[PDB]
Write an enzyme that holds these catalytic residues in place. Structure first.
Site, short mmCIF file in Angstrom:
data_model
loop_
_atom_site.label_atom_id
_atom_site.label_comp_id
_atom_site.label_asym_id
_atom_site.label_seq_id
_atom_site.Cartn_x
_atom_site.Cartn_y
_atom_site.Cartn_z
N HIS B 45 13.37 -27.33 -23.21
CA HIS B 45 14.55 -25.69 -23.01
C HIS B 45 14.49 -25.49 -21.79
CE1 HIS B 45 10.43 -24.34 -23.66
NE2 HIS B 45 11.10 -23.43 -22.33
N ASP B 93 10.64 -30.98 -28.30
CA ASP B 93 10.70 -30.43 -26.30
C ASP B 93 10.51 -30.77 -25.75
OD1 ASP B 93 11.84 -28.42 -24.93
OD2 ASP B 93 10.03 -27.01 -26.18
N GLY B 186 7.64 -18.55 -17.87
CA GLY B 186 7.26 -19.13 -17.34
C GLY B 186 6.64 -20.82 -16.70
N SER B 188 6.83 -22.90 -19.41
CA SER B 188 6.82 -23.50 -20.10
C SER B 188 7.21 -24.68 -19.08
CB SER B 188 7.88 -23.23 -21.21
OG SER B 188 9.58 -22.74 -20.64
N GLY B 189 6.98 -26.19 -20.52
CA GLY B 189 7.60 -27.27 -19.17
C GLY B 189 6.42 -27.90 -18.85
#
Ligand SMILES: [Ca+2]
Lengths: 8, 240
Positions: B45, B93, B186, B188-189
């Site tokens: 995402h 994801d 901020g 995420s990932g």
């Protein structure tokens, strides 16, 4: 749920 | 990261900041993990939008350049082919970013160790979430890299009716959910680093939190389970 980004 | 503190400078050297170009500058949008000198693992995402992205390795303070950073463009984005932007609860994801150049590995820039394919951690296993995300629900981004202890919540508990129910899949890791510590916007990932045989390995890619807020009791932060994707990751790298 709500992805962690802005704002997904 | 909610409920955390400033990380020791450069102590999570596989942590990257994924940034997009924004006017005369660059803006942090997500975390990620350096997995090869020219490959970063992040959330799908984070790269939904077709923007100009760069990765910063060796980063600590987003607002001062401290001589440990290297700034490199994202050249190729490989999203998991089963990711659906419109269905985050389905999973997948995860995305890999091939960098325009190889970064130089050094004391500030190291590869993240991935778990062995299929590895599931026992409930309440020791992990840390790291990131520059909001330090409170509806708060401010962190200038400096934050960390918080976020122990796992196993699949059986996390997918129970009082936690996430069927929204959480076995292709995900859950961690936290005491209503105190959490990932936030901020983060995420980015990684969930879990201690296994004395070594931290990146078991999670931060995916989602509750729509009610970041630190919400019985809504632990939900991560893509990296150990479910080892073959996929290796296939992508080998074919690109
Ligand atoms: Ca800096």
């Amino acid at each position: 749920x709500q992805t962690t980004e802005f704002y997904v | 990261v909610v409920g955390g503190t400033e990380a020791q400078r450069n102590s999570w050297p596989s942590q990257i900041s994924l940034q997009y170009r924004s006017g005369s500058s660059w803006a942090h949008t997500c975390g990620g993990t350096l997995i090869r000198q020219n490959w970063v693992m992040t959330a799908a995402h984070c790269v939904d939008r077709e923007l100009t992205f760069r990765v910063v390795v060796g980063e600590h303070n987003l607002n001062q350049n401290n001589g440990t950073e290297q700034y490199v463009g994202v050249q190729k984005i490989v999203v998991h082919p089963y990711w659906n932007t419109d269905d985050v609860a389905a999973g997948y994801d995860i995305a890999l970013l091939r960098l325009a150049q190889s970064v130089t590995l050094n004391s500030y820039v190291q590869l993240g160790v991935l778990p062995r394919a299929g590895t599931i951690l026992a409930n309440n296993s020791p992990c840390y979430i790291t990131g520059w995300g909001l330090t409170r629900t509806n708060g401010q981004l962190a200038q400096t890299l934050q960390q918080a202890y976020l122990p796992t919540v196993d699949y059986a508990i996390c997918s129970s009716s009082s936690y996430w129910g069927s929204t959480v899949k076995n292709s995900m890791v859950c961690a936290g959910g005491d209503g105190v510590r959490s990932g936030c916007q901020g983060d995420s990932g980015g990684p969930l680093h879990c201690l296994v045989n004395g070594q931290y390995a990146v078991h999670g890619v931060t995916s989602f939190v509750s729509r009610l807020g970041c630190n919400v009791t019985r809504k632990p932060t939900v991560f893509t389970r990296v150990s479910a994707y080892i073959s996929w990751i290796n296939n992508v790298i080998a074919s690109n």
